Design a protein around this ligand. Structure first.
Ligand SMILES: [Ca+2]
Length: 223
């Protein structure tokens, strides 16, 4: 997250870190057994880390649970990043508490202008490189589909939306991928892609979760 703020420990209780020896992507806890992330974050050997603030220090609220199964969306295209969503099942159920909590799925799509909270452990610089240990947060609005399409000609599908600031300076970034965009208490987006990070006229692009609720629910119900 570039241009954001330190969230505070366990203030984003649905945020998870995906770990394969090292943090590599975010995700969102949606029930005791299941995490939502980006399909481009797929790899084997995932350990889901819940209850994290500093990802390099054991602070006392963590739950580390190996994944048993990951399910990339049936129509994910890694070239275009269309349908950039996956589900990860935990080998054992998380113990839910005030610091480790699911986030609700939406019931309708969000609208341009809605404020959302974007979070992660990704790069905090737009030119350089600095990775934080504690979780970072950014409040940002959803942008109109027309401004999103104009910013990225030929690239924005109906399964994507833009959020952020056309002026630059405030965005998600590498290492935030897979993490949440939450608006009014609902998971509306997944950190997906962008041109660099925090660049003028290049807002962040996010997977449009509302399009996937049926698939998420039916997948959980039979897995
Ligand atoms: Ca920790």
């Amino acid at each position: 997250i570039v241009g954001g703020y330190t969230c505070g420990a366990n203030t984003v209780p649905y945020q998870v870190s995906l770990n394969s020896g090292y943090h590599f992507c975010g995700g969102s806890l949606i029930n005791s057994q299941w995490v939502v992330s980006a399909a481009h974050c797929y790899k084997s050997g995932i350990q889901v880390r819940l209850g994290e603030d500093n990802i390099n220090v054991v602070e006392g609220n963590e739950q580390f649970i190996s994944a048993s199964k990951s399910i990339v969306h049936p129509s994910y295209n890694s070239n275009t990043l269309n349908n950039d969503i996956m589900l990860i099942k935990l080998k054992s159920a998380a113990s839910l508490n005030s610091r480790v909590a699911s986030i609700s799925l939406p019931t309708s799509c969000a609208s341009a202008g809605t404020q959302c909270l974007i979070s992660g452990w990704g790069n905090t610089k737009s030119s350089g490189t600095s990775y934080p240990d504690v979780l970072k947060c950014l409040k940002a609005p959803i942008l109109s589909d027309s401004s999103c399409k104009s910013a990225y000609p030929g690239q924005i599908t109906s399964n994507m939306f833009c959020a952020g600031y056309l002026e630059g300076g405030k965005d998600s970034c590498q290492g935030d991928s897979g993490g949440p965009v939450v608006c009014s208490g609902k998971l509306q987006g997944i950190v997906s892609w962008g041109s660099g990070c925090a660049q003028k006229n290049k807002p962040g692009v996010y997977t449009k979760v509302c399009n996937y609720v049926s698939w998420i629910k039916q997948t959980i119900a039979s897995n």
